[PDB]
Amino acid sequence: SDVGGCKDQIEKLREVVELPLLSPERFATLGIDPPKGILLYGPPGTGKTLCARAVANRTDATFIRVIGSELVQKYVGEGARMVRELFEMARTKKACIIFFDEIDAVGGARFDDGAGGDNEVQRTMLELITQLDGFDPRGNIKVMFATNRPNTLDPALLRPGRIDRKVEFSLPDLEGRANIFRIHSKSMSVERGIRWELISRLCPNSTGAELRSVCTEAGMFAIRARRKVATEKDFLKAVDKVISRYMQYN
Amino acid sequence: IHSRKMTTDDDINWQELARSTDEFNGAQLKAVTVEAGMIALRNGQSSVKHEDFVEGISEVQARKSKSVSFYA
Amino acid sequence: FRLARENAPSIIFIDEVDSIATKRFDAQTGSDREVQRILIELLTQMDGFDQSTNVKVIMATNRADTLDPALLRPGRLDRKIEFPSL
Amino acid sequence: MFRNNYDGDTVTFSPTGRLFQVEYALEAIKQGSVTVGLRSNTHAVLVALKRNADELSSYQKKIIKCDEHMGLSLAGLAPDARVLSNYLRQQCNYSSLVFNRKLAVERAGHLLCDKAQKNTQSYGGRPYGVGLLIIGYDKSGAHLLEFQPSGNVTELYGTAIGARSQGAKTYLERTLDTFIKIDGNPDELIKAGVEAISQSLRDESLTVDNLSIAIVGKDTPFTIYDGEAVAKYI
Amino acid sequence: SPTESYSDIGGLESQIQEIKESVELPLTHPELYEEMGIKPPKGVILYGAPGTGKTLLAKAVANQTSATFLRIVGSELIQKYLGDGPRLCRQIFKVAGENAPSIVFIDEIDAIGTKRYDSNSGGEREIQRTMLELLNQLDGFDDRGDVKVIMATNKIETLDPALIRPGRIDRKILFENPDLSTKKKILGIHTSKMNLSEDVNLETLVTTKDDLSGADIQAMCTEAGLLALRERRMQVTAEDFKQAKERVMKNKVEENLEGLYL
Amino acid sequence: SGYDRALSIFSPDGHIFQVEYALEAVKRGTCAVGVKGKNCVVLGCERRSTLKLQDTRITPSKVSKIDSHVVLSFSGLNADSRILIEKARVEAQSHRLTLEDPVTVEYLTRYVAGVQQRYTQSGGVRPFGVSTLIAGFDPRDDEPKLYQTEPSGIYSSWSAQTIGRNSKTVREFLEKNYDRKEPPATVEECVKLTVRSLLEVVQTGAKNIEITVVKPDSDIVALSSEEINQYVTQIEQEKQE
Amino acid sequence: MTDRYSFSLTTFSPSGKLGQIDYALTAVKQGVTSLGIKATNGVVIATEKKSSSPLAMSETLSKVSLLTPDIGAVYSGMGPDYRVLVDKSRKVAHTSYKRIYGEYPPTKLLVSEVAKIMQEATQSG
Amino acid sequence: MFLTRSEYDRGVSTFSPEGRLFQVEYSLEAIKLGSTAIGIATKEGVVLGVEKRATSPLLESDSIEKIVEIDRHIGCAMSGLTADARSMIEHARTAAVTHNLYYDEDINVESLTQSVCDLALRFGEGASGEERLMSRPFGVALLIAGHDADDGYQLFHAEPSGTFYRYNAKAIGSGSEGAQAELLNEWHSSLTLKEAELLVLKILKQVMEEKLDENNAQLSCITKQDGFKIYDNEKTAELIKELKEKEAA
Amino acid sequence: STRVEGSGGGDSEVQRTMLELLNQLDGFETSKNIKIIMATNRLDILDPAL
């Protein structure tokens, strides 16, 4: 309810995660083995990590925050050791799920170079993909990813079995754009009578964050003049400061 | 094969779906299934249909958009 | 040179230097720029402060109409030499 | 799940022979609406379905006349149907001037298998991202067809185009014994198409505005039925 | 603590202010950010053409902060070994957290965070992992705390893809080569100590744009200081100035090498 | 990016770019200005004289005249300036031939524009890095008129305009000093409004100015450098302050 | 390494130089030796015939060729770009000059009518 | 496959594997810029209405003509790329006049709308086998408000893609999405002329940045009896204060 | 003059630290007695920054 009104994409998300852990009596009896892996991709400022810190709140089971910095140690065949132990403890536990982030570091593509200085990190990820799909050490553990470069990463990590589902957090639309303001605006002192259907119309294709900065900086320009309550213009005077005339369109 | 452990209407032409896919991997062809067996449930029904398989396929390649502009 | 001084008196022969030595009007490239970083150190070692018993450079080639005259600054090289062809 | 070249012009082949921009054209139909056709020994017909933008907005033409023994029903990219109609409106008029004859429908599709192939060879141009049907009653009996951008045409007893269709063709794969004997009784043939198309919907309920019909026959010209003159069949 | 401060510079009014209210009030006057009741900004950037006083404006605010401070370059935090940076960047965003409040200052960050490509190589990627672990620290799963970054750069559009957005840096400052009226206040403080009492009439010394920053000022006050001295005269006249100004401006590339656009 | 090369193709926003990139080339060129009252229209242009060998009797004068009752200025680059005029005045002169009534000015500017909106249609042709200002009355009418063209192929009517370098200073200077509902009403006043519109950006030179005015009865005139120094210097008295 | 101002002709590089001409002048320097020097009462024009195989009659094709009775030639470099040239050079005596002056031309006005037959093919890709 | 829009974007004649070609869909995005427009139809009178985007206080704003005459019984608007308009309408009128020769009658309104839409289609083959005249499909999205005897008062939406619609109450341009829902719920089939001019001078208020006056707007209204006329300033200011005298009570 | 591509950066990162040392916080605060001389054969190629 704090997310910025990307109302559909969550529904593809949670349907992976929690319903096969709360209401398996639907998926199983009808005859479907649910998926066990998602991927998230969208441009930045869009709330890929937001919806993922959320679901930990509504987990009803554990969660993991894998720090990608600990998988690239400077001793060979070590980081991979950390991968497999990451799962030996998981399936020990019941119904674990996992949140990677910025796997473009680790799940990069492959190549052959007699310098190949990324040689080692390739040997780590193979501790992963062999572990996700082969001879079923897996029970009920799910996976979660995140990116801003979904083209470069190797096909093997975006094959079904591994990733039975993926989601495009595209940009918002005007209607959904508004419900972002209604979240970030509640804590504020503002007059009753502004009309958001300008502010949305007047903020073209843009992201969750670049709105949150706008709701803010309408407030800051008050403080630059030592008023005590905002207006309708100061929002507009923020937009021209954030986004930042033309005659050949009028 | 993968549909054996499911319900399914007798309506469908499995060969047409083969014709509606080009350069797929068998793993995807499985995930085409569950995304149909799943989307049936989102629509709020129990058995499986033909078109429910279809919008699984468009759910794979991330078409993910009606894109209803100015055609027809 | 760190050793050609050490085992001095010493000299050098280079059976080909026209490869890495040829005039160029500019570099629109990253690789070929390092070829200048090669040369400019070679040209630097002789001319900068050093010993005197080395007579190191004996540049071999197949032609001489290609080198940089900044390599031919007197002090660097001053004895052109020619051999028969046929 | 990676880039491919060879998929940038109709000039070039795959490394196997699949021309691509034709394989991408005739996917376009799958995000245009539905329309179906039927044959008998004495009558042809076709049913359509409309789509709009907002409830204020008017609906979109889906059948267009070409000559009083022919017609067509498009499903796809309309600007590349406005053309082809205005290509065979000419040919069907050419003949009547020079030969005073009725045109053979099966030498109209043959004139559309050509024009959709010229664009397909050479640089410039597109494959006409459309798919359209044909109808009529010339001397050789009733007829129907089913055009594709590739060039390939076929004649047959009644088919469907567009998204959410195969629920229909499974119907028309059943009753082929029936709706061809139906002769001298239009008003029940037409009640098959309207029945067929309802198999292939997603909670639309088939309003009067949404629908449009064409028909021909023994002596009946190409006449279409849209609006308040259509509620008979609901 | 570096001795420079506000009033060591006076060339400008706004660029000083537009970040000061991010960084110097909340340590003093935060009621104005809770009454209006918002979530303040934490992190900016300050770019522009050189010679204009970017690195300066850090050593001023770091004089009058009352909180700690960190002085860095982006090149410092890449090391040869595979996986020594990405944990290093996790250190300083730890030590600052526990030692709150706090301020960070990266300079010439286009060192490491400029742009990404696929990079079929093995060194370019360890530059990326740092770029990717940094942008995890600044905003990710877990929150950072009260850590106010200040980044600097000379060329944005040739760099900086996603490190420059809100969530991480909530504004973007523009420095440019001055106008007329700023310069009236620049040299006046550089020259509040020299005698120069005779005949100068500064007010038409620097007339047009002239394509000179505040840092071409410091040189001219210098060379024209000793150019007097070599004549064994201390207090100064205009000849000593223009004899300098002609020297500096001489070096300028022919910006109007075109002259094609009459 | 990729969308910022040609003319045929659009952004995923709607912007067409190259046209926007020409107007950046305007601003690498000397100023210009145009003012109108009621009995007069004027024009100004800051030139240069930065070279001594160059003979000065044929000084580079932005101004050009299309007919008796019309003048012109420009900006941008001058290799193209000679073209538009050489097609413009042709067209005015192939009008009275064909019609024996000279140009309604709105007919002219729709042909200087028209030659720009054909050179932004097809690849294989370049736009004009140029932006004009028209000034002239119709035959048998008093209403003073002024437009500007622009390589996008558009044009609008303007009571006062300034284009070329540092125009973003001169406009707001003219937003105060003017008032649409009480124009200057004398041929001196538009000039004084016009000269001190140049003095913000012109290093208080006076050899670096050209003014050329226009009136009815097919009237035009260029002014004298010594007729400016007294229109210049008398202002300086008025900022003795 | 390449130069990206050499695969085409109408492109200038920052040294104000064009691409393919510089390499054509190398296509000849790789070719056989030919010459001609001068005297007080005549001019000489020479070259050789590096006959490829022994079985090729080296007489059915002439490096040297007549343009007018008073004018002759020889190349050095590529061949087919010679006999395609002269066949449209000697004509131009018989087309541009002769028929409107009666007589065969001088030696330099012939050259001007060769060198633009040479320059028509270096102005368009 | 993710590189479906990244590469198949720029050439007009490239089908993307989703069936669609993009460089037309971007043309649609152009007219989302520019200044808004509205058209409302009635049994009694058609009406339009626009803002103007006051850019500077010294321009003479009778010049930028977002609304035009095109014939005595037709009138247009446009919320798009400007220069590509005057190549449109100097064709669109030319048919109506030409039609008055070959057939001696006030042309219908839709046929005009079909002649336009058979012009923007010249990045390709037109109807009658024509070949090409451009490569830049242009954003001038029109509203053709007209009258003809067969069917009365009409309007249309003519788009570059060719396909058009007989909307009854439309609003295009930047302030569309906030409006075209607002006009969705306040269009009877039994309105008046002046029960619409006030309406279109209420939506236009709330949707536009500045406040509303006479200067930053105008409008028009054809009629089978009088014709296309663009109303006057003091006439419009009559309606603006009339509105306020209705709001407070 | 700060070209923008792949492996000509590895020296740029060796260039940019030095600009700090000459006018860093500390450098401007410390580089008081330390001093510098540099040479060349050209200055049409360098940055405008040094």
Ligand SMILES: Nc1ncnc2c1ncn2[C@@H]1O[C@H](COP(=O)(O)OP(=O)(O)OP(=O)(O)O)[C@@H](O)[C@H]1O
């Ligand atoms: N839909 C949204 N509603 C509200 N806030 C949002 C939304 N999307 C993004 N934000 C803001 O952006 C921040 C997170 O954005 P996001 O999750 O897109 O980062 P990210 O994409 O993980 O960053 P990176 O791409 O560098 O990994 C949050 O702190 C939040 O303030």
Ligand SMILES: Nc1ncnc2c1ncn2[C@@H]1O[C@H](COP(=O)(O)OP(=O)(O)OP(=O)(O)O)[C@@H](O)[C@H]1O
């Ligand atoms: N208004 C001003 N008052 C006094 N000095 C100024 C002013 N503006 C600029 N300067 C001068 O500019 C110099 C600082 O240049 P600056 O710090 O902008 O370089 P920089 O680009 O920050 O270097 P780096 O990129 O390595 O950080 C100082 O020597 C200072 O004297």
